[PDB]
Design a protein around this ligand. Structure first.
Ligand SMILES: CCCCCCCCCCCCCCCCCC(=O)OC[C@H](COP(=O)([O-])OCC(O)COP(=O)([O-])OC[C@@H](COC(=O)CCCCCCCCCCCCCCCCC)OC(=O)CCCCCCCCCCCCCCCCC)OC(=O)CCCCCCCCCCCCCCCCC
Ligand SMILES: CCCCCCCCCCCCCCCCCC(=O)OC[C@H](COP(=O)([O-])OCC(O)COP(=O)([O-])OC[C@@H](COC(=O)CCCCCCCCCCCCCCCCC)OC(=O)CCCCCCCCCCCCCCCCC)OC(=O)CCCCCCCCCCCCCCCCC
Ligand code: HEA
Ligand code: HEA
Ligand SMILES: CCCCC/C=C/C/C=C/C/C=C/C/C=C\CCCC(=O)O[C@H](COC(=O)CCCCCCCCCCCCCCCCC)COP(=O)(O)OCCN
Ligand SMILES: CCCCC/C=C\C/C=C/C/C=C\C/C=C\CCCC(=O)O[C@H](COC(=O)CCCCCCCCCCCCCCCCC)COP(=O)(O)OCCN
Ligand SMILES: CCCCCC/C=C\CCCCCCCCCC(=O)O[C@H](COC(=O)CCCCCCCCCCCCCCC)COP(=O)(O)OC[C@@H](O)CO
Ligand SMILES: CCCCCCCCCCO[C@@H]1O[C@H](CO)[C@@H](O[C@H]2O[C@H](CO)[C@@H](O)[C@H](O)[C@H]2O)[C@H](O)[C@H]1O
Ligand SMILES: CCCCCCCCCCO[C@@H]1O[C@H](CO)[C@@H](O[C@H]2O[C@H](CO)[C@@H](O)[C@H](O)[C@H]2O)[C@H](O)[C@H]1O
Ligand SMILES: CCCCCCCCCCO[C@@H]1O[C@H](CO)[C@@H](O[C@H]2O[C@H](CO)[C@@H](O)[C@H](O)[C@H]2O)[C@H](O)[C@H]1O
Ligand SMILES: C[C@H](CCC(=O)O)[C@H]1CC[C@H]2[C@@H]3[C@H](O)C[C@@H]4C[C@H](O)CC[C@]4(C)[C@H]3C[C@H](O)[C@]12C
Ligand SMILES: CCCCCCCCCCCCCCCCCCCC
Ligand code: CUA
Ligand SMILES: [O-][O-]
Ligand SMILES: [Cu+2]
Ligand SMILES: [Mg+2]
Ligand code: NA
Lengths: 513, 258, 56, 227, 44, 72, 75, 75, 72
């Protein structure tokens, strides 16, 4: 029974549960990697070794946080649990293919941990640029194991994207138009379209890197007429959409949490929010070379990529202002989920604005490959994607489990994490402006105070992560069973109880025209 | 249930498929670096066993058990369209690599395309024959489709057999051209782009020919009705995708790149 | 050939509680056991290969 | 170079770096104002027991929400692109210098007239002379004439590197098989430091750049003495 | 299949102390792994 | 209809294949291999191939594919 | 001659083709002048420009390839 | 020198570009040789080829246009 | 549906036109006219035009369109 249920699943809820467990484990790995980074940088000098061991840690940190923590939790976990329930569907379109999306991730993760155990690891950065990632400067199995890790995670998400798009298009009640689906459902459909189009281009690029490393191709090798900058275009053609993939489902969860804890039946400006997410998804395909402003491209190309990148602020601004307009006039409940969501609105805005600074090619000459970039992306990932995950987790844990968290503990957890992430990343702006490069194991003495403070911040964030594990334990240990949930009239996912039965919507909803 | 959707029996094939992916990737690693094919051959075997049993079960669920309502069929239509789009974007990466290298040939090449010391195939010889063969197969598969819709078993089988024969002809012609080519995959970016792009295309032709052969045996076994035959539609869509990728390769690599 | 789909419809709709991957009879169990044995054995061998490749 | 507890950019050594400081001041004011306005509006939405939970009309307010940001982006883009095109403008250099990135050191080539080339390696921490900077000094500095337009050409003979000098506003990627161009003009004599700005393996942290800006006559005699 | 709180999960919550051990091993193994990988790389 | 697509298959598509098969047939026969020149952008070897002696491409044809050191 | 002037054929950050073209032009001119037994001093401009722009290792590699018979450009 | 040899660049019945190219080649070479004050005998092959292939009226029109400053080819 | 096509009209198509309009109106300034050269392949006159003095093109702009003999 246990094998049939948990290894042979065709159930959207159990598969969502598997994704959340996987993502939680991955988050502990990514946290450990982040503390090794900050331990190395927490005093001047060398702690671990030279830049190779250091950049193996940095590279693994990024892959684990992106591919094994954020994507599995947002898309595999919240997407599988909530999407079918929010459209009254009985499961996903391809419930057996859904299970293979999940089971590809343990092997993907095994190949990444194998990369780090064999030879000297893949000390390449998560971008895996040649020729450093090539067979001369990274001889041996490490980079190939990283490529194969990415291939399996790629297939997982491509099949997952086919599943979500089909489910969301084909399995709504027949009276429900696409303009009557919840914002979280829109956020997952748009994310799935980005994955479907972007991951195959990554697959092509890392396959070329694989053949340059093993079959004597020369896509990226000037000796054969290749070009290292071609790899960068193919990678970033995927990589910019990838960051929109990382935040879009977070946008969707934020819309639900703000609406819910404002005591509103609906988000402000629903069609604006749909427009904004589709605009961000589209613009996210035409900006990739803002990752390449120092490679030597032509001035008019730099002018185009600057302008196109800045345009993203307009639809993103409509969402931020629409969240504020949802709070406006609310009966505000100061739940732990609301605290995560309010931290999201503010800290995501700050990281979005440092992204607009970086969009300026002329200024990016001096900010590129500095901690200013590191500050920008940790505001949007470690205070944006992560705050949306934590908000969604504390909001929907009682739906998934049938048990309540201790709200006081959850507020403590929020407060500690808020202090730690800001102490970690705010000073990295100063390190960036003043010229500290990325992917350094050690720094000139002038950079010591801000690196010291940043590392102290990382330890506060570790305390929050440890407390979170205790808080989940306390909920399962105490077994406070959910009774009533407010606002079920505009939150269908709650209307089958906590937890919902294994089979929901065996009899579909009645919706007339 | 009072909806039309398919609740799938708990299945081991997702796990066997995931593990076949681990064995194929770890197997390629073991082949490239540790001089051994063992893991790779286990992974290819388990991958083929998984595909066989999974698609067998899809036939059981549809032809034999009746789970493919119109709503289910519509979902499979979208799934196959989306899968084809993802394959289009995969090939787009290789076309980008090709145009990148060929539009700005570096000094190492002699600053020209084709590179110094590269003698391209004549696009009017076997490459043109291959074009005629795949376009012809696009016509015969359309004949097969209309035969099936009109309820004509014999003509469906003859048209589908002709379509498979042309797919096999293309594969044998390409194998012979690979053997005869005076350039290799190691002849710089010209060989790299030529063999990786045409090689992935060749693999898709083999996959598509295999799918058409599956439809051929299912047709022999009377699985398809005149109105319900999604496996045939999906194989036909895939087969048109393979034709169209060939036309782009022919124009880009063989003709414009010569 | 003759149309024997009705006989396969009767076999696969038989009320015997079997999942579809085993409903064809004893041959399905054999091919299932071969597949899962190669996958699990192959996975254990891949772990042994990692252990070996993890040291010089 | 950077100094302890530094918050902003290194002081500008070149006119373009001066331009980037003023453009950053303008952009940062906008970032401060928008961040502040969002935090203030959050705090305003959350500090009343008054309620309004019925459906709210969106279209009027969405005009403000799109037009005002569009205007603000234009006010960033205009000076941004003026500086972009100013750096690209034709200038007539007096001197061309090449740098080649290597694992893990820079070589320099001054081949306008004579075959002058040398390697530039980090001074190990244990060999620093009193008063010298950890991880920043090199054995052989890049001596250059002050107050002169110099063409720097950047490549690599192995993996990617990136040749950066923050106080001159400079960062040019060092790509094997590619010759990337930038221009350098120092308003002042002195020593101007940078660090490799593309992950390049074990000693990425330990291959810095030191420019030594002196009068033309000193540069000429140094050049002659380095053959 | 069992339905309801504590039954829709692949781990038991019947005993809070056995659960603490299982959770300790689960999250603890994830957090430990990178430290042991670094140790492994340093010891070659 | 089926009738029309069969008419196209036998009346246009297969005649085209037959004519292109003729065209290829008439232009077949081994043309004379070029003088070997050890160009550094060709016969790339950054890592031995994982088969044979490591120095032969997968569909190596001795008649027309020189090794890095020339024709066999 | 101080250094290579701005060349409107090569106005962008990537100066690879500028080095290459001037190296080709010098060696084509040198061959044309040694052939009719004319004077290689007419080639001097191309020589100064490629020496200014081109990395030493590129010139060194190209010269070795011309001597080997493996230079892929047309001279 | 009897007449212009076969040129693999221009192997077809349309010889227009053969005449044009050798005319440009001659005048580019003559400008480079006059320019350093070098010697135009170096340019003699191109002179014989264009004189052999080019209609007198084409040569005469092109000569007039070079003197007028309206020749559209780059010399 | 009409709703979707209206959404594309106002949410994508007209915003595109507004941005191209802005792009164009930023590069609308008059460029420097180039030196006149009486090239024989330009300013063709094989027959007088059937309007004006026979020597002016239909949408002749004195600022940027020279006659065979030069700028007016
Ligand atoms: C919970 C959190 C836990 C702790 C977090 C870590 C704490 C960090 C401590 C910072 C204090 C620095 C210090 O030594 O101050 C002395 C410092 C001495 O002044 P100074 O030497 O004359 O410097 C003026 C600079 O020249 C001014 O010119 P500059 O060119 O030298 O200035 C650039 C500089 C200048 O920027 C700053 O000073 C940052 C101030 C942060 C505001 C909080 O850096 C930045 O651009 C930072 C980029 C930040 C990104 C956007 C942030 C959004 C703001 C959020 C709005 C909320 C407001 C309510 O005094 C300050 O300005 C205070 C800071
Ligand atoms: C690089 C690798 C990537 C790692 C990723 C890791 C993440 C994987 C995610 C999937 C989790 C695994 C579940 C499926 C297969 C596991 C099989 C197994 O043995 O499980 C036993 C174990 C539970 O044991 P139990 O309490 O004895 O069993 C209760 C059954 O009802 C009673 O069942 P029964 O009585 O019929 O039989 C149960 C029995 C035997 O059951 C069977 O018959 C199974 C036989 C085949 C199992 C094959 C599955 C192997 C797992 C796949 C991943 C590798 O289980 C045992 O007691 C002994 C099993 C010992 C093997 C332990 C493997 C667990 C995961 C390993 C973690 C990472 C290891 C890497 C080490 C790193 C060092 C460098 O399952 C788990 O491991 C679950 C996770 C552990 C607890 C964590 C709780 C945290 C809460 C966080 C909140 C987030 C969720 C929020 C929503 C909540 C409401 C919906
Ligand atoms: C979730 C992840 C995420 C998100 C959503 C973003 C969003 C944005 N990012 Fe970022 N980015 C990263 C993750 C992300 N980024 C990562 C990981 C890297 C490094 C990659 C690597 O090298 O490893 C990076 C790097 C990166 C670079 C390259 C810098 C360099 O390497 O030199 C640039 C350049 O333009 C960029 C810009 C932007 C911009 C303009 C947005 C916009 O989408 C932001 C828009 C939001 C707002 C602007 C705020 C809200 C708006 C308002 C309140 C309205 C009013 C605003 C205005 C009038 C301005 N980011
Ligand atoms: C999602 C992406 C993400 C996240 C969250 C983080 C989080 C952190 N990151 Fe990092 N980081 C990157 C993505 C991320 N990072 C990327 C892409 C790079 C660039 C890599 C490269 O250069 O190639 C990078 C690089 C990077 C550097 C620069 C290294 C260098 O240039 O040398 C540093 C330096 O301090 C750093 C530190 C941290 C710290 C201290 C945290 C801490 O904030 C982490 C704290 C812990 C958490 C936030 C909890 C996570 C766990 C969960 C959320 C599980 C939840 C469980 C349930 C819901 C059940 N990271
Ligand atoms: C604003 C959007 C576009 C507007 C279109 C045109 C407007 C006026 C003319 C209408 C008819 C157009 C059709 C095409 C015919 C030829 C020329 C039209 C293109 C045009 O308008 O070109 C103009 C010249 O018009 C000229 O000569 C004179 C043009 C007038 C006389 C044309 C006579 C020829 C008619 C031929 C008819 C044949 C019909 C074919 C029938 C086929 C049936 C089998 C260009 O101006 P310009 O000063 O040289 O350069 C600009 C310098 N500042
Ligand atoms: C008739 C056409 C059919 C193709 C069948 C041929 C071979 C096996 C597999 C083919 C798969 C296709 C592409 C893989 C890459 C390279 C092969 C390109 C095609 C080919 O077969 O190229 C040959 C070289 O093969 C070589 O190296 C062979 C190398 C064999 C190992 C391939 C390595 C596998 C790569 C991993 C694939 C990753 C997949 C990504 C999935 C995406 C997930 C997101 C050409 O021979 P040659 O002697 O160099 O020149 C001819 C001289 N007479
Ligand atoms: C040497 C090469 C080795 C590499 C591995 C790949 C090799 C071969 C794979 C060949 C693909 C064969 C697919 C067979 C699918 C059979 C099942 C099927 O076709 O199932 C049909 C549904 O379609 C469906 O699921 C549609 C399912 C479609 C899947 C097709 C996908 C193509 C797969 C490509 C996979 C690898 C590609 C990656 C390349 C980089 C069943 O419905 P109907 O037909 O309506 O019947 C019902 C009626 O009878 C009722 O009256
Ligand atoms: C159902 C499961 C039970 C069966 C388990 C599978 C048993 C397979 C073990 C055999 O191992 C093989 O031995 C060959 C020789 O020892 C290797 O060829 C290698 O050596 C050859 C010649 O020695 C070379 O030609 C090849 O290039 C090379 O890969 C080959 O790779 C490797 O797989
Ligand atoms: C269902 C269960 C799954 C089945 C698992 C099967 C595991 C047993 C495989 C046998 O192991 C083999 O050992 C050989 C040692 O003899 C190796 O030969 C290879 O390595 C040799 C080592 O010297 C070299 O001679 C050559 O590369 C080559 O023959 C080869 O790598 C490896 O396969
Ligand atoms: C930047 C965040 C600020 C939030 C601004 C939100 C403004 C919302 C206005 C729309 O609500 C309106 O309020 C009126 C009653 O007062 C109603 O009468 C009217 O029908 C309704 O539409
Ligand atoms: C006799 C048999 C009848 C099928 C049936 O009605 O059961 C016929 C119908 C169509 C025939 C096939 C098609 O005519 C196409 C092929 C023609 C070749 O000459 C033989 C194999 C070939 C693949 C045929 C095999 C077999 O004779 C088939 C399958
Ligand atoms: C269901 C489709 C709705 C269309 C909305 C169009 C407005 C958004 C425009 C941005 C790009 C969309 C690409 C499709
Ligand atoms: Cu050189 Cu980093
Ligand atoms: O990626 O921003
Ligand atoms: Cu980006
Ligand atoms: Mg860089
Ligand atoms: Na350190």
């Amino acid at each position: 029974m246990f094998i049939n249920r948990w290894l042979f699943s065709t159930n959207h809820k159990d598969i969502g549960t598997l994704y959340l467990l996987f993502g939680a484990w991955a988050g502990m790995v990514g946290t450990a990697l982040s503390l090794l980074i900050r331990a190395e940088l927490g005093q001047p000098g060398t702690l671990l070794g030279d830049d190779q061991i250091y950049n193996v840690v940095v590279t693994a940190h990024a892959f684990v946080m992106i591919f094994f923590m954020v994507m599995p939790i947002m898309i595999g976990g919240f997407g599988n649990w909530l999407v079918p329930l929010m459209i009254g569907a009985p499961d996903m379109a391809f419930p057996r293919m859904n299970n293979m999306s999940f089971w590809l991730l343990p092997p993907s993760f095994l190949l990444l941990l194998a990369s780090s155990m064999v030879e000297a690891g893949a000390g390449t950065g998560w971008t895996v640029y040649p020729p450093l990632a090539g067979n001369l400067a990274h001889a041996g199995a490490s980079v190939d194991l990283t490529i194969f890790s990415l291939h399996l995670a790629g297939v997982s998400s491509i099949l997952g994207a086919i599943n979500f798009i089909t489910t969301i298009i084909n399995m709504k009640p027949p009276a429900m138009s696409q303009y009557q689906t919840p914002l979280f459902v829109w956020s997952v459909m748009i994310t799935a379209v980005l994955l479907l189009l972007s991951l195959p281009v990554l697959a092509a690029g890392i396959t070329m890197l694989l053949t340059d490393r093993n079959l004597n191709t020369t896509f990226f090798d000037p000796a054969g007429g290749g070009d290292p900058i071609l790899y960068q275009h193919l990678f970033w053609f995927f990589g910019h959409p990838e960051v929109y993939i990382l935040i879009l489902p977070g946008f969707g969860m934020i819309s639900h949490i703000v609406t819910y804890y404002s005591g509103k039946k609906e988000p402000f400006g629903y069609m604006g929010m749909v427009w904004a997410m589709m605009s961000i998804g589209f613009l996210g395909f035409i900006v990739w070379a803002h990752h390449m402003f120092t490679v030597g491209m032509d001035v008019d190309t730099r002018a185009y990529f600057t302008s196109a990148t800045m345009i993203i602020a307009i639809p993103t601004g409509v969402k931020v202002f629409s969240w504020l307009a949802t709070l406006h006039g609310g009966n505000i409940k100061w739940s732990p989920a609301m605290m995560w969501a309010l931290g999201f609105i503010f800290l995501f805005t700050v990281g979005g604005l440092t992204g607009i600074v970086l969009a300026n090619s002329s200024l990016d000459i001096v900010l590129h490959d500095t901690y200013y970039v590191v500050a920008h992306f940790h505001y949007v990932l470690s205070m944006g994607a992560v705050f949306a995950i934590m908000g969604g987790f504390v909001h929907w844990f009682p739906l998934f489990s049938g048990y309540t968290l201790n709200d006081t503990w959850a507020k403590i957890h929020f407060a500690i994490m808020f202090v730690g992430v800001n102490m970690t990343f705010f000073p990295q702006h100063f390190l960036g402006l003043s010229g500290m490069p990325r992917r350094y194991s050690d720094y000139p003495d002038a950079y010591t105070m801000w690196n010291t403070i940043s590392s102290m911040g990382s330890f506060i964030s570790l305390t929050a992560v440890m407390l979170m594990v205790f808080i989940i334990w306390e909920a399962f240990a105490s077994k406070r069973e959910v009774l009533t949930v407010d606002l079920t009239t505009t939150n269908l996912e709650w209307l089958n109880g906590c937890p919902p039965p294994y089979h929901t919507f065996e009899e579909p909803t009645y919706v007339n025209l | 249930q009072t909806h039309a959707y398919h609740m799938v029996n708990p299945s081991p094939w997702p796990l066997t498929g995931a593990l076949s992916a681990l064995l194929m990737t770890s197997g390629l690693t073991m082949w490239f670096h540790f001089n051994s094919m063992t893991l790779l051959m286990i992974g290819l075997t388990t991958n083929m066993l998984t595909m066989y049993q999974w698609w067998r079960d899809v036939i059981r669920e549809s032809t034999f058990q009746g789970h493919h309502t119109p709503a289910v069929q519509k979902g499979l239509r979208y799934g196959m369209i989306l899968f084809i789009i993802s394959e289009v974007l995969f090939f787009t990466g290789f076309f980008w690599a090709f145009y990148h290298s060929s539009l700005a040939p570096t000094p190492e090449l002699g600053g020209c395309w084709p590179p110094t010391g590269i003698h391209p195939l004549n696009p009017l010889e076997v490459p043109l024959l291959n074009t005629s063969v795949l376009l012809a197969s696009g016509v015969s598969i359309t004949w097969a489709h209309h035969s099936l819709m009109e309820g004509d078993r014999k003509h469906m089988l003859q048209a589908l057999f002709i379509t498979i024969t042309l797919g096999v002809y293309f594969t044998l012609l390409q194998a012979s051209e690979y053997y005869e080519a005076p350039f290799t995959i190691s002849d710089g970016v010209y060989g790299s782009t030529f063999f990786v792009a045409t090689g992935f295309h060749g693999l898709h032709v083999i996959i598509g020919s295999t799918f058409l052969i599956v439809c051929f045996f299912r047709q022999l076994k009377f699985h398809f009705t005149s109105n319900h035959h999604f496996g045939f539609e999906a194989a036909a869509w895939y087969w048109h995708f393979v034709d169209v990728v060939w036309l782009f390769l022919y124009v880009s690599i063989y003709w414009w790149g010569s | 050939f003759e149309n024997r789909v009705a006989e396969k419809q009767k076999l696969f709709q038989e009320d015997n509680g079997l999942p579809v991957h085993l409903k064809g009879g004893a041959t399905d169990n054999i091919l299932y056991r071969v597949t899962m044995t190669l996958c699990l054995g192959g996975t254990l061998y891949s772990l042994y290969c990692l252990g070996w490749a993890s040291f010089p | 170079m950077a100094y302890p507890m530094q918050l902003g950019f290194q002081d500008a050594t070149s006119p373009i770096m001066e331009e980037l400081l003023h453009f950053h001041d303008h952009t940062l004011m906008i970032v401060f104002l928008i961040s502040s306005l969002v935090l203030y509006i959050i705090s305003l939405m959350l500090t009343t027991k008054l309620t309004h939970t019925s459906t709210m009309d969106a279209q009027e307010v969405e005009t403000i929400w799109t037009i005002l940001p569009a205007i603000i982006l234009i006010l960033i883009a205009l000076p941004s692109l003026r500086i972009l095109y100013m750096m690209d403008e034709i200038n007539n250099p007096s001197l061309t210098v090449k740098t080649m990135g290597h694992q893990w050191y820079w070589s320099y080539e001054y081949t306008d007239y004579e075959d002058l080339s040398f390697d530039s390696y980090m001074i190990p921490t244990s060999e620093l002379k009193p008063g010298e900077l950890r991880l920043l000094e090199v054995d052989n500095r890049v001596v250059l004439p002050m107050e002169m337009t110099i063409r720097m050409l950047v490549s690599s003979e192995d993996v990617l590197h990136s040749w950066a000098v923050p106080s001159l506003g400079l960062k040019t990627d060092a790509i094997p098989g590619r010759l990337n161009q930038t221009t350098l003009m120092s308003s002042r004599p002195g020593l101007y430091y940078g660090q490799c700005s593309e992950i390049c393996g074990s000693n990425h942290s330990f291959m810095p750049i030191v420019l030594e800006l002196v009068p033309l006559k000193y540069f000429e005699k140094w050049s002659a003495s380095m053959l | 299949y069992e339905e309801g709180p504590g039954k829709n999960i692949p781990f038991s919550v019947e005993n809070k102390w056995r659960l603490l051990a299982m959770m300790t091993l689960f999250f603890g193994s994830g957090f430990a792994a990178p430290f042991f990988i670094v140790r492994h790389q340093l010891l070659k | 209809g089926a009738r029309t697509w069969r008419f196209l298959t036998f009346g246009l598509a297969l005649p085209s294949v037959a004519l292109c098969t003729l065209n290829s047939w008439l232009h077949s026969g081994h043309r004379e291999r070029p003088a070997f020149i050890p160009y550094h952008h060709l016969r790339i070897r950054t890592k031995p191939f994982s088969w044979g002696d490591g120095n032969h491409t997968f569909f190596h044809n001795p008649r027309v594919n020189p090794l890095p050191t020339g024709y066999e | 001659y101080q250094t290579a002037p701005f060349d409107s054929r090569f106005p962008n950050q990537n100066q690879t083709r500028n080095c290459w073209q001037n190296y080709l032009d010098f060696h084509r001119c040198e061959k044309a002048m040694t052939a009719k037994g004319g004077d290689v001093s007419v080639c001097e401009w191309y020589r100064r420009v490629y020496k200014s722009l081109c990395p030493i290792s590129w010139v060194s590699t190209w010269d070795d390839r011309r001597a080997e018979g493996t230079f892929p450009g047309k001279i």
